[PDB]
Amino acid sequence: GPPCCLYGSCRPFPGCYNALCCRK
């Protein structure tokens, strides 16, 4: 898929808030 965090960040996608770096 597309990155949830690109360069440490919060980068909003489906399953990004489930993924480990931006776990919101």
Cα 10–chain centre separation: 6
What is the distance between the alpha carbons of residues 11 and 24, in angstroms, rounded to a whole number? 11
Q: What is the DSSP letter of 13?
A: -
| Single-letter code of the amino acid located at 22 | C
Method used to determine the 3D structure? NMR
| Single-letter code of the amino acid located at 21 | C
What is the distance between the alpha carbons of residues 20 and 3, in angstroms, rounded to a whole number? 11
What is the distance between the alpha carbons of residues 10 and 22, in angstroms, rounded to a whole number? 5
